[PDB]
PDB file of C-alpha atoms in Angstrom:
ATOM      1  CA  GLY K   1       8.892  63.648  34.580  1.00  0.00           C
ATOM      2  CA  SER K   2       6.670  62.635  37.431  1.00  0.00           C
ATOM      3  CA  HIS K   3       3.948  60.315  36.615  1.00  0.00           C
ATOM      4  CA  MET K   4       0.578  61.436  36.893  1.00  0.00           C
ATOM      5  CA  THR K   5      -1.389  59.346  38.995  1.00  0.00           C
ATOM      6  CA  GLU K   6      -4.487  58.658  36.391  1.00  0.00           C
ATOM      7  CA  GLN K   7      -7.188  59.199  39.498  1.00  0.00           C
ATOM      8  CA  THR K   8      -9.302  61.049  36.308  1.00  0.00           C
ATOM      9  CA  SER K   9     -12.618  58.564  35.324  1.00  0.00           C
ATOM     10  CA  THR K  10     -11.457  59.007  31.432  1.00  0.00           C
ATOM     11  CA  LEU K  11     -11.039  55.562  31.353  1.00  0.00           C
ATOM     12  CA  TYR K  12     -14.836  55.521  31.661  1.00  0.00           C
ATOM     13  CA  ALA K  13     -15.356  58.629  29.495  1.00  0.00           C
ATOM     14  CA  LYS K  14     -13.318  56.381  26.589  1.00  0.00           C
ATOM     15  CA  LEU K  15     -14.900  53.137  27.070  1.00  0.00           C
ATOM     16  CA  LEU K  16     -18.446  54.476  26.673  1.00  0.00           C
ATOM     17  CA  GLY K  17     -17.220  57.456  24.763  1.00  0.00           C
ATOM     18  CA  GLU K  18     -16.341  55.052  21.168  1.00  0.00           C
ATOM     19  CA  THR K  19     -14.307  51.813  19.908  1.00  0.00           C
ATOM     20  CA  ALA K  20     -10.798  52.648  18.919  1.00  0.00           C
ATOM     21  CA  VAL K  21      -8.732  51.132  15.481  1.00  0.00           C
ATOM     22  CA  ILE K  22      -4.863  50.327  16.244  1.00  0.00           C
ATOM     23  CA  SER K  23      -2.374  47.777  14.608  1.00  0.00           C
ATOM     24  CA  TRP K  24      -1.852  44.184  16.236  1.00  0.00           C
ATOM     25  CA  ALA K  25       2.004  44.839  16.322  1.00  0.00           C
ATOM     26  CA  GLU K  26       1.205  47.486  18.799  1.00  0.00           C
ATOM     27  CA  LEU K  27      -0.668  44.984  21.138  1.00  0.00           C
ATOM     28  CA  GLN K  28       2.602  42.568  21.115  1.00  0.00           C
ATOM     29  CA  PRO K  29       3.464  43.369  25.260  1.00  0.00           C
ATOM     30  CA  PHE K  30      -0.415  43.136  25.678  1.00  0.00           C
ATOM     31  CA  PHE K  31      -1.341  39.304  24.682  1.00  0.00           C
ATOM     32  CA  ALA K  32       2.355  38.478  26.029  1.00  0.00           C
ATOM     33  CA  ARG K  33       1.857  38.776  29.755  1.00  0.00           C
ATOM     34  CA  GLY K  34      -1.766  38.001  28.837  1.00  0.00           C
ATOM     35  CA  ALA K  35      -3.489  41.109  29.763  1.00  0.00           C
ATOM     36  CA  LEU K  36      -5.217  40.883  26.054  1.00  0.00           C
ATOM     37  CA  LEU K  37      -9.032  39.656  26.060  1.00  0.00           C
ATOM     38  CA  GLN K  38     -10.111  38.184  22.478  1.00  0.00           C
ATOM     39  CA  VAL K  39     -14.079  39.174  21.733  1.00  0.00           C
ATOM     40  CA  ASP K  40     -15.490  37.464  18.850  1.00  0.00           C
ATOM     41  CA  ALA K  41     -17.215  39.332  15.286  1.00  0.00           C
ATOM     42  CA  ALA K  42     -20.768  38.433  16.145  1.00  0.00           C
ATOM     43  CA  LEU K  43     -20.566  40.182  19.538  1.00  0.00           C
ATOM     44  CA  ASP K  44     -19.286  44.022  20.391  1.00  0.00           C
ATOM     45  CA  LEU K  45     -16.339  45.838  22.001  1.00  0.00           C
ATOM     46  CA  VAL K  46     -18.697  47.998  24.354  1.00  0.00           C
ATOM     47  CA  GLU K  47     -21.031  45.152  25.982  1.00  0.00           C
ATOM     48  CA  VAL K  48     -17.820  42.943  26.367  1.00  0.00           C
ATOM     49  CA  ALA K  49     -15.677  46.052  27.940  1.00  0.00           C
ATOM     50  CA  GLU K  50     -18.414  46.988  30.278  1.00  0.00           C
ATOM     51  CA  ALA K  51     -18.539  43.394  31.493  1.00  0.00           C
ATOM     52  CA  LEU K  52     -15.100  43.487  32.163  1.00  0.00           C
ATOM     53  CA  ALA K  53     -14.750  46.945  33.810  1.00  0.00           C
ATOM     54  CA  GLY K  54     -18.414  46.417  36.152  1.00  0.00           C
ATOM     55  CA  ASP K  55     -17.107  42.674  36.791  1.00  0.00           C
ATOM     56  CA  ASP K  56     -20.519  41.501  35.552  1.00  0.00           C
ATOM     57  CA  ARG K  57     -19.544  37.787  35.825  1.00  0.00           C
ATOM     58  CA  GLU K  58     -22.995  36.235  34.235  1.00  0.00           C
ATOM     59  CA  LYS K  59     -21.856  38.552  31.110  1.00  0.00           C
ATOM     60  CA  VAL K  60     -18.478  37.703  31.139  1.00  0.00           C
ATOM     61  CA  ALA K  61     -19.180  33.563  31.807  1.00  0.00           C
ATOM     62  CA  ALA K  62     -21.818  33.288  29.432  1.00  0.00           C
ATOM     63  CA  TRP K  63     -18.979  34.326  26.563  1.00  0.00           C
ATOM     64  CA  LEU K  64     -16.215  32.473  28.066  1.00  0.00           C
ATOM     65  CA  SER K  65     -18.403  29.169  27.939  1.00  0.00           C
ATOM     66  CA  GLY K  66     -20.203  30.255  24.656  1.00  0.00           C
ATOM     67  CA  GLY K  67     -16.486  31.105  23.055  1.00  0.00           C
ATOM     68  CA  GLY K  68     -17.586  34.620  22.066  1.00  0.00           C
ATOM     69  CA  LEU K  69     -14.972  35.991  25.030  1.00  0.00           C
ATOM     70  CA  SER K  70     -11.512  34.503  25.263  1.00  0.00           C
ATOM     71  CA  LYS K  71      -7.816  35.663  25.970  1.00  0.00           C
ATOM     72  CA  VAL K  72      -4.575  35.700  23.221  1.00  0.00           C
ATOM     73  CA  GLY K  73      -2.658  33.424  22.924  1.00  0.00           C
ATOM     74  CA  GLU K  74      -0.265  31.989  20.026  1.00  0.00           C
ATOM     75  CA  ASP K  75      -3.113  30.770  18.675  1.00  0.00           C
ATOM     76  CA  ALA K  76      -4.746  33.955  18.322  1.00  0.00           C
ATOM     77  CA  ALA K  77      -1.938  35.904  17.653  1.00  0.00           C
ATOM     78  CA  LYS K  78      -1.039  34.271  14.196  1.00  0.00           C
ATOM     79  CA  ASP K  79      -4.591  34.565  13.540  1.00  0.00           C
ATOM     80  CA  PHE K  80      -5.158  38.485  13.825  1.00  0.00           C
ATOM     81  CA  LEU K  81      -1.593  39.139  12.905  1.00  0.00           C
ATOM     82  CA  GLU K  82      -2.176  37.251   9.286  1.00  0.00           C
ATOM     83  CA  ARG K  83      -6.013  38.556   9.364  1.00  0.00           C
ATOM     84  CA  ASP K  84      -5.913  42.592   9.096  1.00  0.00           C
ATOM     85  CA  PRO K  85      -3.686  43.045  11.458  1.00  0.00           C
ATOM     86  CA  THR K  86      -5.468  46.534  11.750  1.00  0.00           C
ATOM     87  CA  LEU K  87      -8.294  45.807  14.550  1.00  0.00           C
ATOM     88  CA  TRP K  88     -10.691  47.542  16.915  1.00  0.00           C
ATOM     89  CA  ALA K  89      -8.754  47.567  20.570  1.00  0.00           C
ATOM     90  CA  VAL K  90     -10.941  49.414  23.465  1.00  0.00           C
ATOM     91  CA  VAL K  91      -8.689  49.536  26.589  1.00  0.00           C
ATOM     92  CA  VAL K  92     -10.574  48.629  30.008  1.00  0.00           C
ATOM     93  CA  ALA K  93      -9.483  49.378  33.180  1.00  0.00           C
ATOM     94  CA  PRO K  94      -7.780  45.993  34.002  1.00  0.00           C
ATOM     95  CA  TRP K  95      -6.709  45.057  30.564  1.00  0.00           C
ATOM     96  CA  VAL K  96      -7.363  45.786  26.671  1.00  0.00           C
ATOM     97  CA  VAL K  97      -9.955  43.687  24.653  1.00  0.00           C
ATOM     98  CA  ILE K  98      -9.874  43.156  20.632  1.00  0.00           C
ATOM     99  CA  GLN K  99     -12.382  42.478  17.891  1.00  0.00           C
ATOM    100  CA  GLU K 100     -11.204  41.487  14.175  1.00  0.00           C
ATOM    101  CA  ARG K 101     -11.747  44.943  11.617  1.00  0.00           C
ATOM    102  CA  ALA K 102     -12.562  42.287   9.185  1.00  0.00           C
ATOM    103  CA  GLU K 103     -15.880  41.688   9.174  1.00  0.00           C
ATOM    104  CA  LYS K 104     -16.556  38.962   6.549  1.00  0.00           C
ATOM    105  CA  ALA K 105     -20.586  39.222   6.765  1.00  0.00           C
ATOM    106  CA  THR K 106     -22.085  42.584   7.031  1.00  0.00           C
ATOM    107  CA  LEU K 107     -25.652  42.412   6.187  1.00  0.00           C
ATOM    108  CA  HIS K 108     -27.331  45.489   6.971  1.00  0.00           C
TER     109      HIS K 108
END
């Protein structure tokens, strides 16, 4: 049971591959330590995740001050829990980012 040192760029292939859908209750150890970032329904997962992987500071900090990107505490915890709770989670190299599944406005 030797833990495979993940030196492969499978994370790149995952992040820029597609989004992932999971239950919120699986992400409990992630927001507990604070390794969980919340993204708004207006934005997308790939654009916030590439920013947090690529260290794109103007991209990240624009959404931090703009309120499109945040971190998941107790307020966001009970929010997502009582919202879906099934939501779109994409694991970036440092941390995971989540968007709500329930898009209340979908006009295309």
